């Protein structure tokens with residue numbers, strides 16, 4: 001089997017991407033944020049505290065003839081920005097782009113933090129990291145990909161995120177028309193439960209490539225590219241007037257600037273992020289200070305190849321017995 005679904009930016013900055021997901025019988029379609037940096041499929045629901053729902057579409061398990069309470073199971077998750085959600089668990093039929101999993105754990109939110117409530121475009125998350133990170137207790141549950149894997153034509157999914165435009169998540173096949181050149185594959189560490197890999201270096205604009213190992217994760221749920229402070233300083237030094245602002249929370253730059261590209265290495269291959277992908281617009285409405293799309297990871301504890309990086313590539317998440325990642329230009 002295979003599946004193929006379009007993923008759409010939630011706003012004009014590509015803050016995040018939503019993909020329609022069919023849950024239950026008859027189908028209830030929710031727009032979920034496919035997250036390769038987490039392993040829970042959770043949704044706004046008829047159980048979510050009413051004051052914490054503001055425009056999201058909800059899953060109502062009582063209206064699904066295939067929903068079953070997973071007795072005794074609860075979940076609770078906290079993310080990198082400090083947001084969080086928690087609740088109980090149903091199993092139900094879940095389909096993405098024509099690919100159907102029966103008995104998928106659908107984690108129903110009883111509580112969500114304010115950043116979730118305040119975003120009306122995200123109806124929940126669909127985790128695509130390794131199932132070892134799933135938070136369901138006392139019986140950990142498998143991700144949608146883990147459940148689908150054995151049925152797929154090939155045990156892979158691909159992320160093809162658009163710049164200010166829709167893109168595609170495919171399951172079970174590699175669309176050879178969706179990229180240019182060849183796909184370069186690179187080793188993955190599954191020890192921490194993420195798609196963790198090592199970039200071979202970087203370049204700023206037309207500058208020389210610096211060969212240096214940068215360990216990080218391929219995170220479709222993260223908006224920005226978070227890299228070591230040395231790398232980030234080298235990038236922003238090429239933008240006149242750019243500076244790190246403690247009050248704003250990162251590097252800002254004059255909105256009048258033209259940004260240089262940023263290249264990252266994948267083995268001997270190179271992925272080029274155009275400068276425009278690094279512009280996240282005014283820090284507040286009407287400001288002439290703009291927020292940068294490359295930021296320091298120093299306060300995180302790991303480097304994160306988020307959407308800024310991934311949208312410059314066609315990315316293969318190869319879930320074979322020994323997982324690997326593939327990157328191609330496009």
Ligand SMILES: COC(=O)[C@@H](N)Cc1ccc(F)cc1
Nearest residue numbers: 015016081115116119122223
């Ligand atoms: C960090 O929160 C999220 O990822 C979601 N609320 C999506 C989102 C990300 C950034 C932003 F400026 C607006 C929305």
Ligand SMILES: COC(=O)[C@@H](N)Cc1ccc(F)cc1
Nearest residue numbers: 033035037079080081221222
């Ligand atoms: C740092 O982790 C992240 O931000 C994503 N991997 C998870 C995440 C996705 C959407 C959202 F609204 C909040 C958090």
